[PDB]
Amino acid sequence: FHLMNHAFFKALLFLSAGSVIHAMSDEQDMRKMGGLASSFPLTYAMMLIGSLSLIGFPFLTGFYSKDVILELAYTKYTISGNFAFWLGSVSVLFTSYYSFRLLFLTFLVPTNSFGRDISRCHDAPIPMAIPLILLALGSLFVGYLAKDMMIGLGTNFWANSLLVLPKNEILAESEFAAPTIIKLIPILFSTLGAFVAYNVNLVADQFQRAFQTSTFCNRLYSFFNKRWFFDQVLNDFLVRSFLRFGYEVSF
Amino acid sequence: PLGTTGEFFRRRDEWRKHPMLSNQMRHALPGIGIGVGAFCVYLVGEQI
Amino acid sequence: AAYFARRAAQKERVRILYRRALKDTLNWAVHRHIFYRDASDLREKFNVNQDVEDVDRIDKLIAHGEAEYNKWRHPDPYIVPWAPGGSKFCRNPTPPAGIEIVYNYGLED
Amino acid sequence: MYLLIVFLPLLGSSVAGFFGRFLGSEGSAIMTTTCVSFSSILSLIAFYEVALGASACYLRIAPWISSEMFDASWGFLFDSLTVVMLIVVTFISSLVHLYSISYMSEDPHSPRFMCYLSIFTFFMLMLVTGDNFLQLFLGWEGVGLASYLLIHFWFTRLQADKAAIKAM
Amino acid sequence: VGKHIVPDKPLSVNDELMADTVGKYEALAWLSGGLGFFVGLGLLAVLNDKASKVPFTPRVYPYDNLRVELGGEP
Amino acid sequence: KKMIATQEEMSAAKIALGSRDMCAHLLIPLNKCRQAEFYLPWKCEDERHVYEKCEYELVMERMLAMKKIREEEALAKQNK
Amino acid sequence: DHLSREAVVDRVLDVVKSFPKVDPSKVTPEVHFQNDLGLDSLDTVEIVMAIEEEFKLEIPDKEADKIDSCSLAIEYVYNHPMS
Amino acid sequence: GGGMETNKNKFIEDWGSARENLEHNFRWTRRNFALIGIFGIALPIIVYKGIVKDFHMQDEDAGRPHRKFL
Amino acid sequence: GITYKGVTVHTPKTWHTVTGKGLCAVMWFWILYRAKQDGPVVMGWRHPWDG
Amino acid sequence: SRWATPGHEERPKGYFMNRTPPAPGQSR
Amino acid sequence: SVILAGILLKFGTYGFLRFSIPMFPEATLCFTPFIYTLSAIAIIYTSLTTLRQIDLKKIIAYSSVAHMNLVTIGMFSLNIQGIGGSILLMLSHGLVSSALFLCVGVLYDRHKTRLVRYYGGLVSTMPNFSTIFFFFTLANMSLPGTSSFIGEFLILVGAFQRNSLVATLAALGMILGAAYSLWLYNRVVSGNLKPDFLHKFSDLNGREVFIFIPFLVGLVWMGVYPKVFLDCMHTSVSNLVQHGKFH
Amino acid sequence: GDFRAKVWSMTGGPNCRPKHWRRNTAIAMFGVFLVCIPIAKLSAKLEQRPHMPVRPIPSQIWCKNFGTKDDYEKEH
Ligand SMILES: CCCCCCCCCCCC(=O)SCCNC(=O)CCNC(=O)[C@H](O)C(C)(C)COP(=O)(O)O
């Protein structure tokens, strides 16, 4: 159910990104954008719908599946279930941050861009805008329309396609035996992420100075920017080891 | 923009005060008034 | 002379390091207004050391400058897309000149 | 009708790839979009008959690898999970074909792009519709291939070539 | 693209095959710490023992917990 | 709460094994309404509301059974 | 389309006129930043960086340090087909 | 200007010939002795015993004695 | 469009502005509509079968 | 205009298997 | 090269199937860990050497060694899938490696060099050769749908039913064989041309295209419908496996 | 560019604009539709639907394999 829902707003987010990029002469760095909401109203509108649905804003397509997963993880009374609930919940704060961070930098902050790009802007042609509007309708209504079909309690829609053994069934307990606060954590977490994004990208002005003077804070910035140095470690230790073996040892 | 370095770049950024390039936060929530207005008309309609 | 060339070569090192440190300042600031304050501050250091005439203490300031730039450099600098390293670099490039196409190759005769 | 779902994108890709010199940018764009969109409509009909109508479809074309008990087959399975994935794949692909029609208009090599788009779609359909592990493996590898071909679609760019090899 | 560099210096070995600011073993230590966060979090999940504070009794299904319906002896 | 839907009725209704619980007798009308109405959410609200209430009743019953058991774990500790 | 030398000439001069130590006059397409105008070399690289942002170009650091007159800044942008 | 044959590069060809003639460079050093011992002798013996052990663990899973191998 | 000192901004196409405002307005209304229909349910105030 | 104005390639670029066509009226 | 790799290489594996395996069943069982070890080492080690080769013909030659040692794992698995897969891979290799030696020869007859560094960018001047070269590149990676995947997977099936460790080491060639085949294809075909080395180009002529046709048809025909071959083999394969046992 | 006009390719190379691309596109349409006809006939012949749908469905018009695999203890 989250898969089909995801296929709607994520596709709307990539296709909307492409329209901004095509409009801005193949610019892709968000630090050279901003002040584009009024220049591209159609694109921003589709990006808002997709983003708000991705972050799980109530009653959109993403809300009817993201929240049920986080509810079911709380209901799983196992070590791995507890592991998932903690990590899935904190990520909601993190996804709300970068979702709004994108929007603010790209379309709402005072322009950070080059003049020659701004004076050559244009918005989506018809064959590009038609899929965006169809995906907006999907990223707003598909989730509500398909819930009872897909994860309605006791539904027979899947027939014999999926199997859940009786001992593993938790949907009823996840919807009734849960404290009301648990179902409100994602919206409370999403709101915090939007507010934090507004502050870092619209107010703070000496924040970056922490990294330009502190060694630990500078490595920390590069740690999360370079993806936990995963590619590096795997290149310096794994790919290079096998490449060197095929010459120095086997050959 | 106090020092000559800062004063230069603000002087060159003087086109960034474009009317429809600045104050973009008032466009943040398009269709907010119309959606509320329609909700108002619907809410009155449901009373009868 | 030689002191001219040696000092002039030292001039180039400073001017480029200012150019690179000034652009990397915009990478860390993003916003224009934050860049004005940070650019003014970076200029003032190059001015604090501009009085030094000991050619040797200059070579030492320059080397300390490069170390500072290489240490506090932005891990994701901005690149114009068509420039080297950019997102559009080497995309649909123009054909090279001097390419010839041979017809009727490898005939039995 | 169920075979037309899987094999229409293959037909669309075949025409654009082998005969793109006769259709050009505009002809190949229409050809691959029409076949994928027709397959999208049949997929909506298949969702109505299998999921809404509760009537699964089983289709077996021929054996693939028959060695003693090994019985890999060219066979298709259409149940409720299948027609959900058919809808997702065919609908999104049809839109992306329409989107690419104007997004790649200024590209010199649009017909090869549209051909690669449709061959990816065909392999993904072969992945979700297979009734055995080996047909799923064929779809699994095929979408690995089509992704490689599309990541380095700008073959002159070295980072794309580095990325496509890493993906594969 | 523009002009491919034709070598003018004797080519060395490991040229067919030839991550800037952070060292090799320092990156391994930072990634190791990041993975050590998941390890400590997982241990904290064991120490929590959520399985011991379940607020309902295990579901019981009729007909001997659906023994026949699950493939057991009829 | 006693079992109503016999084994044959559940099998003929093709109910998922995980939903063959005490409230199965109400699921059968619900799923027949759901298929006939193309599973739209503004349909079958009546059969859906009845069946959900039964399932809510079941989970509360097991929650209260543990509420008890938890009050005897401490009894053993308070007398140990 | 390409940009005419006149269009370049107007724009690059406009870039140096904004410099605070530079008064609006005595700026002809030929003047040298450090001589006639009497600026420091650090002042020149900021002008080169403003000329960079004006035409959205990425001049290599080597070629950037050679540009020391408005005549050198004009001929570079004109040659560049991505200005 | 003339012909389809490649314009030979002296540096690239030298790299090519030095690759083909590597056996003239073998010296029997400490590093080579460790490399040949580890990957020419020790590793194949480890793989051999792993394969035999895999068979033997099957034998005691079937209630059978350990099958003899050369 | 409008020119302000070198940099010119072109006004967006009218139907682009109309559709953008309209689609989000449709979105805002659908949110207010839903929150009033099953808002107390997700808050835990009442239950669907209450009545 | 890309859909209403026909193309410009009177004949395709290149030759199939890089063989020059025979003289008009002649067979390969 | 076509004769050497496509036919002469098959004589050792044919001799294992015709003489050693059926005539000495007891010794064959005793030497099965020994054959498994040698083949596994050859697959892993020679695949990594292939990665570091710089001559076009050397990459193709070294690939042949790894493919032939996977054949020996299959025939010494001593079951229908292993021996059936081993014969199919033998036949597939004689078509795929032969076609690959034909692609390199196409390049060599024109430009007279085998060094990968000189080539590159060839898709812009020889698209027909590039497409044919890519297809046999995929067949060399044992892509499903090609003739080589049928023999490869059947051998892994037969090896898994005997020893799961040797089947695991043999399955590592899926990763390694992909790495050197795509790296070879990209360095020759992809990228930009280098006019200082090569500036005059000719795509395939009528004789070269026709030469490649039966290789494409054969590779596809076995890859999608290996039944026409397996049917004619299973009776001989079955009796080879049963030779020396009476239960 | 310049030399690519002398290079033959199946997909047409860069900026392929065949003059008669519309009649070739329509001829290509017909070929696919003619190819689809045997495919559809074979599909209809091969489909197996062991379950009667809850409501009439378009595949009951051409497919005659509905409710056939009831006898499963006879399949070989
Ligand atoms: C990411 C960034 C991190 C931080 C990097 C910043 C680097 C540190 C800043 C300080 C660098 C130094 O000390 S570098 C030392 C700078 N000082 C000197 O070279 C001594 C005398 N030089 C001269 O003759 C001129 O004043 C000259 C300065 C060349 C200009 O010429 P103009 O008068 O014609 O502009």
Residue-range domain boundaries for chain G: 7-83
Orientation angle between helical segments A79-103 and A185-202, nearest 10 degrees: 40
What are the tokens at A17? 């990104």
- Cα distance between residue D118 and residue A57, in whole Å: 34
Q: Name, in order, each residue with C-beta under 8 angstroms of G9's C-beta and a sequence gap of 6 or more.
A: G29, G74
What's chain G's Rg over C-alpha atoms?
12
List of E strands, chain H: none
Per the entry, the structure determination technique was: cryo-EM
The answer to whether A61 touches A52, Cβ cutoff 8 Å, is: no
Instruction: Please tell me if the CB atom of residue C41 comes closer than 6 angstroms to any atom of ligand 1.
Output: no
Q: What is the CB neighbour count within 10 angstroms for residue A177?
A: 17
Q: Name, in order, each residue with C-beta under 8 angstroms of I41's C-beta and a sequence gap of 6 or more.
A: I47, I48
Phi-psi region of L50 (alpha: psi -120 to 50; beta: other; left: phi over 0): alpha
Give the resolution to one decimal, in Å: 2.8
Instruction: Give me the count of residues in chain E.
Output: 74
Orientation angle between helical segments G70-79 and G41-55, nearest 10 degrees: 30
- Cα distance between residue K231 and residue D65, in whole Å: 11
- Cα distance between residue G16 and residue F3, in whole Å: 89
Q: Name, in order, each residue with C-beta under 8 angstroms of C7's C-beta and a sequence gap of 6 or more.
A: C55
Q: What is the CB neighbour count within 10 angstroms for residue G62?
A: 9
Please report which helix (H) or strand (E) contains residue A249, including its range.
none
Q: Which residue of D has its CA nearest to K176?
A: D168
Contact between C92 and D158 using a beta-carbon 8 Å cutoff: no
The answer to whether D120 touches D114, Cβ cutoff 8 Å, is: no
- Cα distance between residue A113 and residue H28, in whole Å: 62
Task: Scan for tokens 């040696």, then name that residue.
Answer: C6
- Cα distance between residue A120 and residue K66, in whole Å: 56
The answer to whether G42 touches C18, Cβ cutoff 8 Å, is: yes
Residue L61, judged by CB atoms within 10 A of its CB (0-12, 13-18, 19+), counts as exposed
Distances (CA, A) of C81 to A106, C73, C91, D149: 17, 20, 10, 23
Q: Is D168 helix (H, G, I), strand (E, B) or coil?
A: coil
Phi, psi of K196 (to 5 degrees): -70, -25
Question: Measuring CA to CA, which residue among G60, A3, C98 is closest to residue D81?
Answer: A3
Query: Which amino acid makes up residue G48?
Result: V
Query: Which amino acid makes up residue K100?
Result: L
- DSSP alpha helices (H): ranges in G18-69? 41-55, 61-66
Contact between C100 and K201 using a beta-carbon 8 Å cutoff: yes
- Report how far ligand 1's centroid is from the alpha carbon of C50 (Å): 6
- Cα distance between residue E72 and residue K158, in whole Å: 34
The answer to whether G9 touches G74, Cβ cutoff 8 Å, is: yes
What's CA A195's distance to the chain center, in Å? 16
Question: Measuring CA to CA, which residue among I15, B18, D94 is closest to residue A45?
Answer: I15
K48 and chain A in contact, CB less than 8 A: yes
> What DSSP state is assigned to residue A219?
H
Question: Measuring CA to CA, which residue among G44, A31, G64 is closest to residue C35?
Answer: A31
- Cα distance between residue A174 and residue I17, in whole Å: 43
Q: Ligand 1 pocket test: which of C16, C47, C49, C72 has the largest number of ligand atoms within 8 Å of its C-beta?
A: C49
Q: Name, in order, each residue with C-beta under 8 angstroms of G24's C-beta and a sequence gap of 6 or more.
A: G17
Cα angle E32, E37, E42 (rounded to 5 degrees) comes to 125
- Report how far ligand 1's centroid is from the alpha carbon of C56 (Å): 14
A7 and chain D in contact, CB less than 8 A: yes
What are the tokens at A222? 């590069």
D106 and chain C in contact, CB less than 8 A: no
- Report how far ligand 1's centroid is from the alpha carbon of C47 (Å): 7
Query: Which amino acid makes up residue G75?
Result: E
- Cα distance between residue A42 and residue A124, in whole Å: 8
Phi, psi of K102 (to 5 degrees): -75, -30
Q: Is A112 helix (H, G, I), strand (E, B) or coil?
A: coil
- Cα distance between residue A51 and residue A57, in whole Å: 9
Instruction: Please tell me if the CB atom of residue G35 comes closer than 6 angstroms to any atom of ligand 1.
Output: no
Question: Measuring CA to CA, which residue among I14, I31, I32 is closest to residue A49?
Answer: I31
The answer to whether H70 touches K34, Cβ cutoff 8 Å, is: yes
Cα angle G48, G49, G51 (rounded to 5 degrees) comes to 65
Question: Measuring CA to CA, which residue among D163, D160, D116, D106 is closest to residue D142?
Answer: D116
- Domain range spanning residue C90? 1-109
Tally of structural domains, chain C: 1
One DSSP character per residue, A53-95 reads: HHTT-TTSTTHHHHHHHHHHHHH--SHHHHHHHHHHHHHHHHH
What's CA E48's distance to the chain center, in Å? 22
* Torsion angle, alpha carbons of B2, B5, B6, B9, to 10: 150
- Cα distance between residue K158 and residue K76, in whole Å: 9
What are the tokens at G20? 């605070």
> What DSSP state is assigned to residue E15?
-
- Cα distance between residue K123 and residue K185, in whole Å: 10
Distances (CA, A) of F25 to A163, D40, E62, K110, K211: 21, 39, 13, 80, 71
Contact between C39 and B16 using a beta-carbon 8 Å cutoff: no
Task: Scan for tokens 């087909």, then name that residue.
Answer: G81
Instruction: Please tell me if the CB atom of residue C52 comes closer than 6 angstroms to any atom of ligand 1.
Output: yes
Cα angle K213, K215, K217 (rounded to 5 degrees) comes to 70
- Which residues from B are below 8 Å from C33, CB to CB? 1, 10
One DSSP character per residue, F12-52 reads: HHT--GGG-STTHHHHHHHHHHHHHTTT-TTSSHHHHHHHH
- Cα distance between residue K44 and residue K97, in whole Å: 19
Sign of CA dihedral F12, F14, F17, F18: negative
- Greatest C-alpha distance within chain F: 60
Helices (runs of H) and strands (runs of E) counted in chain I: 1, 2
Which residues sit opposite I9 in a β-bridge?
I2
Cα angle D100, D106, D112 (rounded to 5 degrees) comes to 60
Query: Which amino acid makes up residue F43?
Result: K
Phi, psi of B6 (to 5 degrees): -65, -35
Residue B48, judged by CB atoms within 10 A of its CB (0-12, 13-18, 19+), counts as exposed
- Cα distance between residue G83 and residue K70, in whole Å: 58
Q: Is G77 helix (H, G, I), strand (E, B) or coil?
A: helix
- DSSP alpha helices (H): ranges in chain G? 5-17, 41-55, 61-66, 70-79
Q: Name, in order, each residue with C-beta under 8 angstroms of D125's C-beta and a sequence gap of 6 or more.
A: D5, D6, D9, D39, D86, D89, D90, D139
- Cα distance between residue K188 and residue K133, in whole Å: 10
What are the tokens at K210? 């026709």
Q: Which residue of C has its CA nearest to E4?
A: C96
The answer to whether K191 touches D156, Cβ cutoff 8 Å, is: yes
Please report which helix (H) or strand (E) contains residue B24, including its range.
none
Phi, psi of L3 (to 5 degrees): -85, -20
Task: Scan for tokens 């005595």, then name that residue.
Answer: G26
- Cα distance between residue A149 and residue K170, in whole Å: 46
> What DSSP state is assigned to residue L4?
G
- Cα distance between residue K212 and residue K214, in whole Å: 6
> In this structure, are strands D70-78 and I2-4 parallel, antiparallel, or unpaired?
unpaired
What's CA K71's distance to the chain center, in Å? 10
* Torsion angle, alpha carbons of L38, L41, L42, L45, to 10: -170
- Report how far ligand 1's centroid is from the alpha carbon of G14 (Å): 27
K128 and chain L in contact, CB less than 8 A: yes
Contact between K52 and A242 using a beta-carbon 8 Å cutoff: no
- Cα distance between residue D16 and residue D23, in whole Å: 8
A131 and chain D in contact, CB less than 8 A: yes
Q: What is the CB neighbour count within 10 angstroms for residue A1?
A: 16
What's CA A109's distance to the chain center, in Å? 20
Cα angle E40, E46, E48 (rounded to 5 degrees) comes to 100
Q: How far is E43 from chain F, CA to nearest CA, in Å?
A: 25
Q: Name, in order, each residue with C-beta under 8 angstroms of C36's C-beta and a sequence gap of 6 or more.
A: B1, B5, B6, B7, B9, B10
Which residues sit opposite F28 in a β-bridge?
none
Q: How far is K171 from chain D, CA to nearest CA, in Å?
A: 15
- Cα distance between residue F47 and residue A153, in whole Å: 12
- Domain range spanning residue F8? 1-80
Residue of I11, I17, I19, I45 to mutate for A, most A C-beta atoms under 10 A:
I19
What are the tokens at E50? 């959520």
Contact between G55 and A116 using a beta-carbon 8 Å cutoff: yes
What are the contacts of A227-230 at 24+ separation with CB within 8 A?
A228/E30, A228/E31, A228/E34, A229/E22, A229/E27, A229/E28, A229/E30, A229/E31, A230/E31
What are the tokens at H39? 């990957």
What are the tokens at C29? 């600031």
Contact between L22 and J6 using a beta-carbon 8 Å cutoff: yes
Distances (CA, A) of F39 to F44, F48, K242: 9, 11, 59
Which residues sit opposite K201 in a β-bridge?
C101
A32 and chain B in contact, CB less than 8 A: no
Question: Measuring CA to CA, which residue among A167, A41, A190, A197 is closest to residue A107?
Answer: A41
Question: Measuring CA to CA, which residue among A108, A100, A124 is closest to residue A21?
Answer: A124
C11 Cα nearest atom in ligand 1: 29
What are the tokens at A56? 């799980």
What's CA K196's distance to the chain center, in Å? 34
- In SS3 terms, D99-155 reads as HHHHHCCCCCCHHHHHHHHHHHHHHHHHHHHECCHHHHHHHHHHHHHHHHHHHCCCC
